[PDB]
C-alpha cells in the first residue's frame, strides 16, 4: 500500500533523461579524446571530472560551478512532480526545450520521439560499453 516502485511515467522520464545525457556523453568522450580547451587540466575522459574537482584554479573552478549550477537549476525547475505516481501534468521528458520548433505536428512529434528514444538507447549502450570496456580491459573489443 506504499508506492515504493515508480510509475511508467517516471520510468520514461528517467529513460529520456539518460538517453539525452548519454547522447551528450558519448560525443563528449570522443571530442575530449580529440580536442581540448586551454586552462583545463589534461586527463582522460574517465578522470577529467576528478582532476577538475581536485585542481580548481584559474577557470576550471568557475566553469564547473557554472555547469553544476545550471544542472541543479534545470533539475529543480523541471522536477517531474508526481510522475512517480503517474499524475504528472506534462508529458514525460517534455521540458519544452524547442528553440527552433523543428517538431510541432503530432505525427512528427511521435516519429521524433521514437527516433530520440532509439538514439538515446544506443548512446546509453555505447556509454556503458565504454565504461565497462575501460574498467575491464577485455570486455569490449573497441576499447
Partner 1 sequence: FEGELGVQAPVGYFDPLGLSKDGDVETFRRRRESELKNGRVAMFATIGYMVPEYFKFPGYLAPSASLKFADVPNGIQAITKVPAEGWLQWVALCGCYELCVNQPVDAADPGNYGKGKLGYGNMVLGITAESISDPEARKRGLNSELANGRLAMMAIMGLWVQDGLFGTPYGLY
Ligand X SMILES: CC(=O)O[C@H]1CC(C)(C)C(=C=C/C(C)=C/C=C/C(C)=C/C=C/C=C(C)/C=C/C=C(C)/C=C/[C@@]23O[C@]2(C)C[C@@H](O)CC3(C)C)[C@](C)(O)C1
Binding site for ligand CLA (CB under 6 A): 59, 62-63, 66-67, 70, 72, 76, 79
Find all residues with CB under 8 Å of 32, minimum gap 6, and list them: 44, 45, 48
Instruction: Give me the least distance between CB of 61 and ligand DD6, in Å please.
Output: 25
DSSP class of residue 90? Answer: S
Sign of the CA dihedral with 112 first, then 118, 122, and 128 last: positive
* Binds 76: which of ligand DD6, partner 1, ligand CLA, none (CB < 5-8 Å by kind): ligand CLA
Q: Is 96 in the site for ligand X (CB under 6 A)?
A: no
Nearer to ligand X among residue 76 and residue 99 (C-beta): 99
Instruction: Give me the least distance between CB of 109 and ligand CLA, in Å please.
Output: 25
Instruction: Give me the least distance between CB of 65 and partner 1, in Å please.
Output: 7
**What are 28's three cell numbers?**
563528449
Nearer to ligand CLA among residue 65 and residue 114 (C-beta): 65
Nearer to ligand DD6 among residue 41 and residue 90 (C-beta): 90
Asked if residues 10 and 83 have their Cβ atoms less than 8 Å apart, the reply is: yes
For residues 71 and 97, give the distance between their C-alpha atoms in angstroms, rounded to a whole number.
14
Instruction: Give me the least distance between CB of 100 and ligand DD6, in Å please.
Output: 4
For residues 6 and 16, give the distance between their C-alpha atoms in angstroms, rounded to a whole number.
15
Nearest-CA neighbor of 125 among 38, 37, 19, 9? Answer: 19
Q: Which residues bind partner 1 (CB under 8 A)?
A: 58-59, 61-62, 65
Q: Which residues bind ligand X (CB under 6 A)?
A: 99-101
Amino acid at each position: 500500500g506504499n508506492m515504493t516502485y515508480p510509475h511508467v511515467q517516471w520510468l520514461r522520464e528517467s529513460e529520456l533523461k539518460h538517453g539525452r545525457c548519454a547522447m551528450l556523453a558519448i560525443v563528449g568522450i570522443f571530442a575530449q579524446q580529440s580536442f581540448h580547451i586551454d586552462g583545463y587540466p589534461e586527463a582522460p575522459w574517465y578522470e577529467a571530472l576528478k582532476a577538475c574537482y581536485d585542481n580548481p584554479a584559474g577557470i576550471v573552478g568557475f566553469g564547473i560551478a557554472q555547469i553544476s549550477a545550471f544542472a541543479m537549476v534545470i533539475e529543480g525547475a523541471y522536477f517531474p512532480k508526481d510522475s512517480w505516481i503517474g499524475q504528472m501534468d506534462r508529458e514525460p521528458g517534455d521540458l519544452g526545450f524547442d528553440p527552433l520548433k523543428l517538431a510541432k505536428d503530432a505525427e512528427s512529434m511521435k516519429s521524433m520521439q521514437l527516433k530520440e528514444l532509439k538514439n538515446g538507447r544506443l548512446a546509453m549502450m555505447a556509454f556503458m560499453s565504454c565504461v565497462v570496456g575501460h574498467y575491464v580491459p577485455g570486455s569490449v573489443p573497441g576499447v
